[PDB]
């Protein structure tokens, strides 16, 4: 129609003006007098071996001790990080797994990938083994991320440019979030578990409301596909990593771009983004086999986590902020402190 | 210094390690092929002769092959193609009868150029299956090949086609020093395609075995 030519575009213009009406100062100017974090040195405290293929996913437990990892060898291993013991080893029906989640209660785990099916596995069974509790189907594209709301609800993002909130007991899609024009690569859940941000391949990250299921907000600025996303611990901001070798801290309340983390020596994309407990340090896994820790308030590279022999595919920080786990394509999980 | 429960947990972890090692040893002995095509280009026929990923397992000469079909993935290929980085070979199916349809041969050529020159398949060999021999013969006796390639200059006989079809497909491989393209002409009823795939996989495994020794 004629209106789509300008009306929507006109609205876009207004939005920019609104953002231009609030960018009186920048984050660097505000946090210019803050003392720098300084050099950050983390050593590889633990190395987890047992995966025989590229590790594509990892998720810490809420007890900050157990962690689940997924590899292309068809294995979902639940690790005791303190003693490097293998608590569980689940063989997956499909070895093309690209994501995994660990339930906050610790009773269930989730996996999914190129099979377009989110498999929920029950860990606390009277039989003493791990069995497929549920197999949620309905996504028409590869399932790239999944996060547990509780023992009964789970949000997933797939390559069909849609997200879905599933009720596990019924196995149906309680809600469907649409609006992305590209593959959704990652999603993050807010601490209050009422909103969630999903970054897609259209170089945009959308804030959705879980309750009613509508796109509350849209954030742009990236020049390539967004591969990772993570909320600030406060819950009023988030960080996105993309393929243009740039991380970006966006603001929910200001609905703008707060800060950009990039270096000229970095030309490789970001595969994973995570925050520390206080939010001062932003950890990002890169394709150059490294993992950079930035001063989230100063856009200064505080440190480099360089041990891995292949692309750092997944990254996580414990809820108590005591350790950072990195999983790379060299089939090794490394805990840093 | 461990307690009884901790020692038993360590024993369970060691048993899990043993099972994982056995499973990995079993998986490493299996051949993984990635089946690609331009849609309805003979992939179904090739699968017959031997939602998401479709895995087909078949045993030939005491060798287990797993073909992964990605036809159901309508999303962006570059976001998940790196999963198939360790496949022994890529079976690319091209229908010879699609040269005068809509252009479609040009689409197959573009797909082959994208797959062969991908940054992940820098050393993964490609087995090229040119399907529909008989229908191609019928359509080339009547319709000249100049419809697909305006620059063609040759007779319109079935003796054509490897030269100026397979040659054009192989010229898209501008990394010839690192990989080889195995081209085979096949039809509906051949029963020799499995043997050709086995021979190509033997060559690939010999090359990889040598690279492992450093000989290469």
């Amino acid at each position, epitope marked *: 129609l004629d209106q789509l030519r300008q009306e929507a575009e006109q609205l876009k213009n207004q939005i920019r003006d609104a953002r231009k009406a609030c960018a009186d100062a920048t984050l660097s100017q505000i946090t210019n007098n803050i003392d720098p974090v300084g050099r950050i040195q983390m050593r590889t405290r633990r190395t987890l071996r047992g995966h025989l293929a590229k590790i594509y996913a990892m998720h810490w437990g809420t007890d900050s*001790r*157990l962690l689940v990892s997924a590899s292309q060898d068809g294995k979902l291993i639940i690790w*005791d990080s303190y*003693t490097t*013991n293998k*608590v*569980h080893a689940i063989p997956l029906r499909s070895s093309w797994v690209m994501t995994c989640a660990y339930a906050p209660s*610790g009773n269930y785990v989730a996996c999914g990938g190129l099979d377009n099916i989110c498999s929920i596995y029950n860990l*606390k069974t*009277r*039989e*003493g*083994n791990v069995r497929v509790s549920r197999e949620l189907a309905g996504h028409t594209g590869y399932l790239s991320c999944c996060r547990f709301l509780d023992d009964n609800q789970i949000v997933t993002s797939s390559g069909d440019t849609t997200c879905a909130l599933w009720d596990i007991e019924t196995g149906q899609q309680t809600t469907t979030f649409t609006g992305h024009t590209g593959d959704v690569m990652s999603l993050s859940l807010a601490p209050d578990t009422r909103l969630f941000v999903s970054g897609a391949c259209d170089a945009s990250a959308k804030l959705w409301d879980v309750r009613e299921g509508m796109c509350r907000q849209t954030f742009t600025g990236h020049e390539s596909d967004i591969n990772a996303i993570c909320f600030f611990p406060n819950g009023n901001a988030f960080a996105t990593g993309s393929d243009d070798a740039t991380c970006r801290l966006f603001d929910l309340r200001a609905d703008q771009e707060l800060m950009t983390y990039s270096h000229d020596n970095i030309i490789c994309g970001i595969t994973s983004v995570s925050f520390s407990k206080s939010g001062r340090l932003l950890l990002a896994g890169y394709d150059d086999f490294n993992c950079n820790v930035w001063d989230a308030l100063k856009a200064d590279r505080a440190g480099v986590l360089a041990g891995h022999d292949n692309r750092v595919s997944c990254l996580g920080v414990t809820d108590d902020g005591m350790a950072v786990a990195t999983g790379s394509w060299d089939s090794f999980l490394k805990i840093w402190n | *210094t461990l*307690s*009884a*429960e*901790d020692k*038993a*947990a360590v*024993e*369970r972890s060691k*048993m899990i390690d043993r099972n994982l090692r056995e499973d990995g040893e079993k998986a490493a002995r299996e051949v993984k092929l990635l089946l690609l095509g331009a849609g309805e280009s003979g992939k179904s026929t090739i699968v017959k002769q031997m939602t998401g990923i479709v895995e087909t397992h078949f045993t030939f000469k005491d060798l287990h092959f797993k073909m992964f079909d990605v036809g159901a993935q309508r999303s962006e290929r570059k976001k998940w193609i790196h999963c198939f980085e360790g496949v022994t070979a890529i079976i690319f199916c091209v229908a010879l009868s699609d040269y005068d349809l809509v252009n479609r041969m040009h689409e197959s050529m573009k797909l082959f150029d994208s797959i062969c020159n991908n940054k992940w398949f820098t050393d993964t060999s490609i087995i090229l299956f040119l399907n529909k021999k008989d229908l191609f013969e019928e359509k080339i006796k009547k319709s000249p090949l100049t419809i697909c390639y305006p620059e063609y200059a040759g007779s319109n006989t079935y003796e054509e086609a490897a030269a100026y079809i397979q040659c054009q497909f192989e010229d898209l491989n501008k990394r010839k020093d690192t990989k080889e393209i195995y081209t085979h002409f096949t039809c509906s009823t051949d029963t020799k395609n499995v043997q050709f795939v086995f021979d190509a996989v033997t060559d690939v495994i010999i090359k990889n075995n040598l690279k492992d020794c450093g000989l290469f």
Partner: single-chain antibody
Amino acid sequence: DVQLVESGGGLVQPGGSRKLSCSASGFAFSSFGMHWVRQAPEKGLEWVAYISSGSGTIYYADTVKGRFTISRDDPKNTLFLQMTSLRSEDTAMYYCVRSIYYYGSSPFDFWGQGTTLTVSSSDIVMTQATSSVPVTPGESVSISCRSSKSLLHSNGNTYLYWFLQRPGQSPQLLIYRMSNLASGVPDRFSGSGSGTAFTLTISRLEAEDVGVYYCMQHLEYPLTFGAGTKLEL
């Protein structure tokens, strides 16, 4: 359902030999360590033997080492106890217990029904002092236990278990590692305490709670049970 049905009991002449079998159904027998635990007629429980998962670790009590032997047939899901040179002290009801060991696991979840074997004519000490406590239903009861050696390991876990044996029934797990409540146990039970001094508190003592309470240690391996405190009325 999960069950351990066992047989092999009866009357045995002294100096003989008998084979006790325990068929397990309803759970992954291969992934569970298995314990043989005997209870003499009227003097509480006593741990006897243990086979690990995969049969990689075998343990026996001091009073049955060498004399007894324990094995498992995983394909047939069976646990065997070959017990020879039997004496008058071996008459007891034997129980087949499952226990899986990993982080956060609950050992000694399920106990078998027990088979009576009647013969025709270091070592942490667990003490419970009081053996009989008569309390009317509806009140709160505290049951005490003590150990010769502190059960608080360097890991932070305190390996003590609280079991209940109801009249004419097999022992049931209530508390594992002194703080955790076993699955299916009502919340009215609560275990607490520190090394060398442990307690189990029942807030609203209802019916079907009368029985004998045992405190067991798991820090050293010759596992030892308490004398047993019995609840009346």
